Design an enzyme around this catalytic site. Structure first.
Site, PDB file in Angstrom:
ATOM      1  N   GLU A   1      55.436 -50.445   0.259  1.00 23.97           N
ATOM      2  CA  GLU A   1      54.110 -50.158  -0.285  1.00 23.97           C
ATOM      3  C   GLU A   1      53.048 -50.416   0.766  1.00 23.97           C
ATOM      4  O   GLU A   1      52.109 -49.626   0.925  1.00 23.97           O
ATOM      5  CB  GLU A   1      53.819 -51.035  -1.511  1.00 23.97           C
ATOM      6  CG  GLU A   1      54.896 -51.034  -2.626  1.00 23.97           C
ATOM      7  CD  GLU A   1      54.949 -49.695  -3.347  1.00 23.97           C
ATOM      8  OE1 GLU A   1      54.035 -48.874  -3.118  1.00 23.97           O
ATOM      9  OE2 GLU A   1      55.877 -49.487  -4.157  1.00 23.97           O
TER      10      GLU A   1
ATOM     11  N   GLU B   1      52.517 -42.636  -8.857  1.00 21.52           N
ATOM     12  CA  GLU B   1      53.274 -41.793  -7.940  1.00 21.52           C
ATOM     13  C   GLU B   1      53.107 -40.315  -8.237  1.00 21.52           C
ATOM     14  O   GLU B   1      53.260 -39.501  -7.319  1.00 21.52           O
ATOM     15  CB  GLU B   1      54.758 -42.171  -7.974  1.00 21.52           C
ATOM     16  CG  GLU B   1      55.462 -41.845  -6.673  1.00 21.52           C
ATOM     17  CD  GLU B   1      55.019 -42.807  -5.586  1.00 21.52           C
ATOM     18  OE1 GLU B   1      55.333 -44.007  -5.733  1.00 21.52           O
ATOM     19  OE2 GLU B   1      54.310 -42.391  -4.649  1.00 21.52           O
TER      20      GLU B   1
ATOM     21  N   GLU C   1      58.548 -40.399  -1.736  1.00 17.10           N
ATOM     22  CA  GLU C   1      57.995 -40.531  -3.080  1.00 17.10           C
ATOM     23  C   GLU C   1      58.732 -39.640  -4.077  1.00 17.10           C
ATOM     24  O   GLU C   1      59.145 -40.110  -5.142  1.00 17.10           O
ATOM     25  CB  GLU C   1      56.485 -40.234  -3.056  1.00 17.10           C
ATOM     26  CG  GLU C   1      55.732 -41.305  -2.202  1.00 17.10           C
ATOM     27  CD  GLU C   1      54.259 -41.015  -1.934  1.00 17.10           C
ATOM     28  OE1 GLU C   1      53.899 -39.831  -1.721  1.00 17.10           O
ATOM     29  OE2 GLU C   1      53.439 -41.981  -1.922  1.00 17.10           O
TER      30      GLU C   1
ATOM     31  N   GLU D   1      48.470 -47.724  -3.023  1.00 20.29           N
ATOM     32  CA  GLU D   1      49.493 -48.469  -2.289  1.00 20.29           C
ATOM     33  C   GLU D   1      49.084 -49.919  -2.077  1.00 20.29           C
ATOM     34  O   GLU D   1      49.950 -50.802  -2.001  1.00 20.29           O
ATOM     35  CB  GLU D   1      49.801 -47.813  -0.939  1.00 20.29           C
ATOM     36  CG  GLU D   1      50.144 -46.321  -1.012  1.00 20.29           C
ATOM     37  CD  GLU D   1      51.351 -45.979  -1.887  1.00 20.29           C
ATOM     38  OE1 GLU D   1      51.943 -46.851  -2.584  1.00 20.29           O
ATOM     39  OE2 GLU D   1      51.723 -44.781  -1.868  1.00 20.29           O
TER      40      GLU D   1
ATOM     41  N   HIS E   1      50.689 -39.000  -5.933  1.00 20.89           N
ATOM     42  CA  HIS E   1      51.117 -38.997  -4.540  1.00 20.89           C
ATOM     43  C   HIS E   1      52.021 -37.806  -4.242  1.00 20.89           C
ATOM     44  O   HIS E   1      51.800 -37.088  -3.262  1.00 20.89           O
ATOM     45  CB  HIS E   1      51.818 -40.319  -4.190  1.00 20.89           C
ATOM     46  CG  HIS E   1      50.993 -41.540  -4.488  1.00 20.89           C
ATOM     47  ND1 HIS E   1      51.425 -42.820  -4.193  1.00 20.89           N
ATOM     48  CD2 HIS E   1      49.777 -41.678  -5.074  1.00 20.89           C
ATOM     49  CE1 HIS E   1      50.511 -43.690  -4.587  1.00 20.89           C
ATOM     50  NE2 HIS E   1      49.499 -43.026  -5.121  1.00 20.89           N
TER      51      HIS E   1
ATOM     52  N   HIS F   1      50.054 -51.436  -5.337  1.00 25.28           N
ATOM     53  CA  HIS F   1      51.492 -51.682  -5.439  1.00 25.28           C
ATOM     54  C   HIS F   1      51.941 -52.871  -4.588  1.00 25.28           C
ATOM     55  O   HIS F   1      52.864 -53.599  -4.984  1.00 25.28           O
ATOM     56  CB  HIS F   1      52.263 -50.445  -4.994  1.00 25.28           C
ATOM     57  CG  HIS F   1      51.929 -49.218  -5.775  1.00 25.28           C
ATOM     58  ND1 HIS F   1      52.304 -47.959  -5.366  1.00 25.28           N
ATOM     59  CD2 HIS F   1      51.243 -49.057  -6.932  1.00 25.28           C
ATOM     60  CE1 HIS F   1      51.884 -47.069  -6.255  1.00 25.28           C
ATOM     61  NE2 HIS F   1      51.233 -47.708  -7.211  1.00 25.28           N
TER      62      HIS F   1
HETATM   63 FE   LIG Z   1      53.192 -43.695  -3.155  1.00 28.57          FE
HETATM   64 FE   LIG Z   2      53.535 -47.042  -3.795  1.00 19.11          FE
END
Ligand SMILES: [Fe+3]
Ligand SMILES: [Fe+3]
Lengths: 515, 168, 131, 392, 392, 74, 136
Positions: A103, A232, A198, A133, A235, A136
């Site tokens: 992360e 996610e 991802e 991130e 992402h 996370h």
């Molecule tokens: Fe990500």
């Molecule tokens: Fe992440």
């Protein structure tokens, strides 16, 4: 005028601001990325999840309040933090802290994507990803923080950001979802971080693992990880937009397949053996065979829904896939041999497979009993678990010709005389230095790009030093200063100390001295 | 044979004593350039201090950087290399050099040697980073042309390795 | 429907039968799939959406939908596309519920995902490449 | 039914919970329950902010302060390290020393901005219901606010994007968090300016909230010529990540940005009957002061007083400040030409009023930044340099 | 070893969880899972606000809309019922019909106010750090704002306490929530005025944030004579709970209160360079508009248009409005004497400016309330009545 | 003045406002309870938990978020 | 200490022995007690406060404290008074923690309770009735 006005209640919704974001950029000669890249094609794309700063914070704060309510109120009052099977509570020392560095690196990789984006909307989207991130990173930290407070063994939950540096499995973590993202082509992160990392690997790593946590009594990790992955979707969608731009330009599309194969191999080389080892050997109750988890998420669903669909537009099935499937079946069992043999260098307490585990391994991986099973049972007979035994299996491997090598590229350990996964040893001398490579894909990366791959391995740093001195220097002890964090059993009695390690007399060799 | 401890050892201590004797920008520039040619990159001259050279390089950088701020005019910190060269001239020279390279083997040695000679604090950071990025763009593009085109047996020959072992 | 099961096809096999198909030559390259996968983390709002939207109007519109209980999350797989309208969810839940709120417990996607208006969609379509 | 096992939960399934209880030891195996207990606390006790943030970045011992060892596993083509000392001119004995005084990890940061997000929309629904826009000066609303406050969003947007390379290049975790939170606050400022314009357009027939005119003004009007030149240089002209943060927040935004947001648009709103704009500048000015606390810690507490490299770092910070202060002074000299377009208000828009506003901005800046790094500055000289652009 | 049993949890203890699992049926015993599914929804589907609030009050069928039966279990000495029809002159076919359009039950109400609570303290810490108080007009600050805005807190406080008997006497649950939330918003307004004065005192040496001078002004200055007289009557002079809510929010606060808060203190802050007060009036005006939505629903949708008693209720509402509008006109006539103490600003504090402010307040009021209950009002006549108190 | 001011960061804590609450009442003849009571004694006492409206809301909302997280999520 | 147990005294008896004491003549009127009872609902913050404050310095200063585990809450009984300093708790927790935050999980009180500065106190004293014993 001063008297008449529409007094209907109105605000301004996020999408009303978002539609003006693309006009926030302006033209000037220097307005281009600072990072090296092969990819120079037009990339004026549109965000699929319209977000502005205020709405970003509203959404994420709402996720947080539910998560921290569950953790700090409900699960704490239930005593849930100590209702976890010891094998699994030990596994989360590793999964959460290793994921934390993935992360953390994803913050920096996302910033490279922000820097290399040319559309204001995509720059806006990548900032939201950069922020996620960071979220996370703190979520992974919070799991180990909560375990430190509530689980029966806080050691190693409480200090992995330094104690991880002792051991060999950490080295490969610094490449797999880390250096391999941030040290290279910035636009290419849309391929390695996003289309592969991802869209493929975060599903088994972050989602599927919550089922194993639940089976083993852990409701902390589902509460957090399932919230992590909600981010996610944005992402994967960011990265897809750029992959489309790459695909639509013949000059940039000619790089895509090689970058996709190198990314897939790089990530699977470590992820496949290490997460399979943590799932199957770091659990009591098993959800399903790892190789089926991998088949479902990696080969069939990501492989078919992303890569197979993109095959219509010239994207090729990774050439390394056949080698990878062999890894999915055996490489985590190979890795378990090294993990158990070198247990003093870790920060977790391990458990040899018990009788019902062994039956499960043999039923689902026929041949396991006659190879891996017999080795573990002999180690147990020799005193694997007993601190008075003077037995550490790394020395036993060497006394039987079962040398351990480190891949110069991936850092994954390799025991050619016992491995059933993909691999074969290549040892080259170059300019006075020996290097061990372990597969066709990494050997090519090193032959073409030696100045990218100069990572010192544990045998080079520790050569000729005794095991207990390395552990003590790296702080691999509990608060009494003597009892190891790492253990070869999960019971509360008969814990090993530095003096118990020292009696084994284990000294690090140079594995390439023989060549 | 037997490595000393990781973070505190006689090799690092002995090199720190050498670095402390540097007293001018010219002397420390020759010192750091000689060091980076001798001990860094796959084309280094010696692996004798392999597990210590990165820390030692940090300490040389720190000594040169303090000598620069103590001894040089501000304008030199922005516009010159500590070799005395004009920083923009260095940039133009090495970008032209790598664009004239005829193979990925020529290109990689130019990029590696640029870093060995001009890594900060020799070149100002802003000029160095943008030069390093321009060089890396060219190197990546030439390396990623027909990346899978040469078999491993032929790559080993082009690289010039001595093959010590190939498992059957 | 059966092809969209979590344990469809090779996943029914164990032991040697699994290995024989896993290592079969035809299964060493990916195969295009028309499916999408949607993961919803369990919660009061999600569980009501599963029971009264996905498994009623969703499955009536798309009979290929499969929902499996994975302890902490719902696993959903379907041919083509899956859609959830936050406005319909908001009516079911009796509280303010925008598409942004819907995403609080949408944990993962295999497929192309986006929101448009109040609706969330995940699709097999390759937008920007497909016509 | 379903094709896959309905996994039994170990927390609640009787058989698995009993097996787990038999396996869990009856006593704790260590007493140290403080997560990352070895971090050196900045304050009287270790904070959760520090515990969750510090040493998440995996630096080796050859990047000052790192606890790891050895080279990176994979570097850029040519050899640039994943993170490295070549990223900045500044040096320190420990890149991890920085602490945000607001102690923001991700959760308190989005918690606070969520409050502002929701309250903003409630405020707007009530403000439109109130009809309070009826007393705003129309010339201010249409010719000054809409056009030149609109154009100011491009300054905020450019400062936002200056952080992209900082987020990749900077060398520790607390610094990266400070930088990324600062970037989001800048793009928030730009979005909030556009939100105010879009809101006025719903209340005022004929009011055009398109960015066309603001962008033309930012890109071509002499009033923003110096500002745009400075922002372009800070964003795209340099890559030293400390230079970006210092030039961006501690020089340009602390002088030009503060004058434009606080002395011009916020202050003059409360001279021309604008009851709407102060709600929006309240947010940008709150964000400015929060960002300043963290920027101040990085450059003053950590870098300008680092035991080994403080004077070294002040040499570079002094050189940067000389350059970007000249750029910002030129930006303000251009900008005060806008006063020729506003209605005269004694003590606010006449020469004495503008002179006192510049004395506040340069005087505060001398106290907040210049004095703390040893940069000598003659405030009256800077005030007079800018007033040369003021039309009497 | 504590003296009492350590109780085993049925959710996690294997033995008790197994016993519970054997006892729980394998299917649901009804399919109706909508809590209080029989409430008639005001909107397209039942809201959580309605589910949690509606019919919590246990009224019998002899209080219109009640679902229970029989007399109360215990009444006052003499026979006054626990709740009863004698509490108000107004009548309805169902006291439960009211719906707050913001749908506030307790949780969303305190969630929103918490956001404002925390953001206010961040704003103040930054505003003091900014130094923005330096450009306020000192005379406005010291002679008008401190003294007469301070005195206005007593109006808000009196309106707060008018709700005490409403909270006890009113006849349904959604009405009780509306009243109590309105009451907290009024005492919040009073507290926020004092908070602003206490904050300025930290910034301005010699500025006195004691309530001594505001209280003397409220209790004895002719400028607040009519307002204080009205507040005393609405709070302590009547007990009909509908009369209190109507006179308080729909007449007095919607005319006098809106003029003082919005047309005087908020508007003129943005003429005298006051960058602080608009932050505080933003909150009171948001609260006013939220309260008005609920008050409007109660009196217009429910009571003035009740299918059986609408005209009956308008007879009382018209009589109350006649009385309290005269009280409020007199309050405003007194209050506009304050303009004789402020610096003249054309279009704001001259006769034309004050006349346009009164036209906004009375004109908006006619649309928002009078027209909806059939109350005839000549706006120009009310404006002229107030301007008779304006010193030219 | 217009240039000089203390720029130390300050806010206003709830007990700072609460100290002034007792002074918000004022004297008038009709200022007495509406309800019948036997008890007519002096009762000018002080709160033991100083609270103002903003702080009331902050506290209760904090309790609520934890409770509803536990119910709706965990 | 023992007299402050949840099951002190008559609560140890069962069956007829309990009934005989429960219905004894002398137990038909209240008896003055010098104790206080404090209930804390279980949570991450509260459980840290119990372990490191109440059961350490709290009990060191007042050894009559009894703490009992009641599943969802902690039951605390002591002679005279119990105090918790929110400043000490915030130092322990590493996060903002005022006396108002302390109250989020303070569930019940039998005794006279109040906050003063950063400290929460529950006491047997009858404030406003009991007279001060020192002029100091
Ligand atoms: Fe990500
Ligand atoms: Fe992440």
């Amino acid at each position: 005028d001063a008297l008449k006005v529409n007094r209907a209640p109105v605000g301004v919704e996020p999408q009303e601001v978002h539609k003006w974001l693309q006009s926030f950029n302006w033209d000037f000669k220097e307005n281009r990325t600072k990072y090296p890249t092969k990819y120079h094609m037009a990339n004026e794309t549109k965000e699929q999840f319209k977000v502005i700063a205020k709405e970003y914070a509203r959404m994420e704060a709402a996720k947080d309040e539910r998560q921290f309510g569950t953790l700090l109120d409900g699960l704490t009052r239930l005593g849930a933090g100590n209702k976890v099977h010891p094998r699994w509570g030990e596994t989360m020392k590793v999964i959460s802290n290793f994921l934390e560095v993935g992360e953390y690196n994803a913050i920096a990789a996302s910033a490279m994507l922000w820097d290399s984006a040319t559309a204001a909307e995509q720059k806006n989207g990548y900032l939201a990803q950069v922020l996620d991130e960071i979220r996370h990173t703190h979520q992974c930290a919070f799991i180990n923080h909560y375990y430190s407070k509530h689980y029966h063994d806080p050691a190693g939950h409480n200090d992995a950001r330094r104690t991880r540096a002792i051991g060999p499995l950490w080295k490969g973590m610094k490449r797999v979802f880390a250096d391999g993202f941030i040290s290279g082509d910035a636009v290419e992160c849309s391929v390695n971080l996003q289309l592969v990392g991802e869209a493929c690997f975060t599903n088994p790593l972050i989602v599927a693992v919550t089922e194993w946590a639940s089976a083993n009594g852990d409701e902390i990790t589902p509460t957090v990880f399932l919230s992590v992955e909600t981010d996610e979707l944005r992402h994967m969608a960011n990265g897809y937009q750029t992959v489309v731009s790459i695909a639509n330009d013949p000059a940039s599309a000619k790089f895509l397949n090689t970058d996709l194969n190198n990314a897939f191999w790089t990530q699977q080389k470590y992820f496949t053996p290490v997460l399979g080892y943590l799932f199957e050997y770091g659990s009591k109750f098993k959800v399903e065979p790892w190789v089926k988890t991998w088949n479902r998420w990696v080969y069939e669903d990501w492989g078919g829904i992303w890569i197979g669909r993109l095959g219509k537009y010239g994207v090729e099935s990774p050439a390394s896939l056949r080698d990878a499937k062999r890894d999915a079946y055996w490489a985590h069992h190979d890795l378990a041999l090294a993990a158990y043999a070198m247990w003093p260098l870790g920060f977790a307490r391990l458990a040899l497979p018990d009788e019902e585990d062994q039956a499960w391994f043999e039923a689902n991986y026929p041949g396991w009993a006659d190879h891996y099973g017999k080795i573990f049972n002999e180690w147990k007979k020799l005193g694997y678990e007993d601190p008075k035994s003077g037995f550490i299996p790394y020395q036993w491997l060497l006394a039987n010709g079962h040398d351990v090598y480190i891949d110069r590229v991936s850092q994954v350990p390799f025991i050619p005389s016992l491995a059933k996964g993909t691999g074969s040893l290549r040892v080259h001398e170059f300019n006075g230095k020996k290097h061990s490579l372990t597969d066709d894909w990494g050997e090519r990366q090193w032959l073409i790009e030696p100045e990218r791959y100069e990572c010192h391995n544990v045998f080079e740093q520790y050569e000729g030093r005794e095991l207990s001195e390395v552990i003590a220097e790296g702080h691999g002890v509990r608060s009494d200063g003597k009892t190891l964090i790492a253990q070869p059993h999960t019971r509360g009695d008969n814990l090993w100390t530095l003096e118990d390690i020292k009696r084994a007399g284990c000294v690090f060799p140079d594995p390439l001295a023989k060549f | 044979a037997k490595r000393e401890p990781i973070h505190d050892n006689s090799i690092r201590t002995e090199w720190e004593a050498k670095i402390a004797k540097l007293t001018s920008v010219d002397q420390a520039t020759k010192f750091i350039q000689d060091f980076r040619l001798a001990y860094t990159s796959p084309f280094r001259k010696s692996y004798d201090i392999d597990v210590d050279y990165q820390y030692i390089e940090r300490k040389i950088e720190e000594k040169l950087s303090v000598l620069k701020t103590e001894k040089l005019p501000v304008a030199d910190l922005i516009t010159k290399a500590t070799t005395g060269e004009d920083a923009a001239a260095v940039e133009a020279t090495w970008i032209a050099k790598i664009k004239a390279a005829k193979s990925k083997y020529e290109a990689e040695r130019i990029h590696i040697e640029f870093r060995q000679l001009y890594k900060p604090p020799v070149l100002p950071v802003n000029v160095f980073l943008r030069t390093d990025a321009a060089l890396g763009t060219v190197l990546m593009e030439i390396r990623n042309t027909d990346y899978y085109g040469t078999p491993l047996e032929g790559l080993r020959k082009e690289r010039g390795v001595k093959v010590l072992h190939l498992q059957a | 429907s059966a092809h969209n099961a979590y344990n469809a096809g090779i996943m029914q096999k164990t032991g040697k039968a699994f290995a024989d198909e896993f290592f079969a030559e035809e299964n060493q390259v990916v195969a295009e799939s028309n499916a999408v996968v949607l993961v919803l983390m369990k919660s009061d709002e999600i569980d009501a959406i599963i029971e009264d939207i996905v498994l009623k109007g969703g499955k009536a519109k798309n009979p290929s939908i499969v929902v499996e209980d994975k302890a902490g999350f719902w696993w959903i797989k379907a041919d083509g596309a899956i859609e959830i309208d936050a406005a319909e969810a908001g009516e079911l839940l009796g509280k303010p519920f925008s598409v942004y709120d819907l995403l609080i417990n949408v944990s993962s996607t295999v497929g192309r995902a986006y929101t448009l208006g109040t609706k969330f969609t995940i699709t097999s379509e390759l937008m920007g490449l497909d016509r | 039914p379903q094709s896959s096992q309905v996994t039994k939960r170990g927390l609640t399934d009787p058989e698995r919970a009993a097996i787990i209880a038999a396996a869990v030891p009856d006593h704790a195996l260590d007493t140290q329950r403080k997560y990352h207990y070895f971090i050196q606390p900045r304050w009287k006790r270790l904070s959760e902010y520090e515990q969750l943030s510090c040493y998440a970045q995996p630096n080796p011992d050859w990047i000052a302060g790192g606890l790891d060892w050895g080279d990176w596993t994979q570097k850029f083509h040519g050899g640039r390290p994943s993170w490295g000392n070549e990223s900045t001119e500044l040096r320190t004995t420990d890149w991890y020393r920085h602490r945000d005084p607001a102690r923001r990890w991700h959760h308190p940061y989005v918690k606070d901005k969520s409050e502002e997000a929701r309250y903003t929309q409630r405020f707007l629904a009530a403000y439109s219901s109130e009809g309070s826009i009826r007393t705003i000066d129309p010339y201010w609303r249409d010719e000054i606010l809409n056009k030149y406050f609109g154009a100011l969003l491009y300054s905020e947007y450019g400062l936002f994007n200056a952080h992209s390379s900082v987020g990749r290049d900077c060398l520790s975790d607390t610094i990266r968090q400070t930088a990324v939170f600062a970037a989001l606050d800048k793009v928030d400022n730009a979005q909030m300016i556009q939100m105010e314009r879009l809101f006025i357009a719903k209340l005022v027939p004929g009011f055009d909230a398109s960015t066309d005119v603001p962008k033309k003004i930012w890109t071509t009007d002499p009033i923003y010529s110096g500002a745009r030149a400075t922002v372009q240089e800070i964003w795209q002209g340099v890559q030293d990540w400390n230079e970006i943060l210092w030039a961006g927040h501690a020089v340009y935004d602390a002088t030009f940005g503060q004058f434009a947001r606080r002395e011009f648009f916020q202050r003059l709103a409360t001279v021309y009957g604008d009851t709407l704009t102060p709600f929006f500048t309240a947010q940008s000015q709150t964000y400015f002061q929060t960002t300043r606390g963290a920027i101040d810690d990085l450059f003053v507490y950590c870098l300008a007083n680092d035991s080994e490299f403080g004077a070294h770092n002040r040499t570079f910070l002094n050189a940067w400040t000389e350059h970007y202060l000249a750029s910002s002074v030129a930006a303000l000299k251009d900008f005060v030409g806008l006063y020729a377009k506003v209605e005269k208000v004694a003590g606010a828009t006449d020469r004495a009023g503008v002179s006192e506003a510049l004395q506040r901005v340069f005087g505060d800046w001398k106290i907040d930044y210049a004095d703390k790094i040893g940069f000598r500055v003659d405030v009256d000289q800077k005030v007079d340099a800018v007033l040369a652009g003021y039309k009497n």
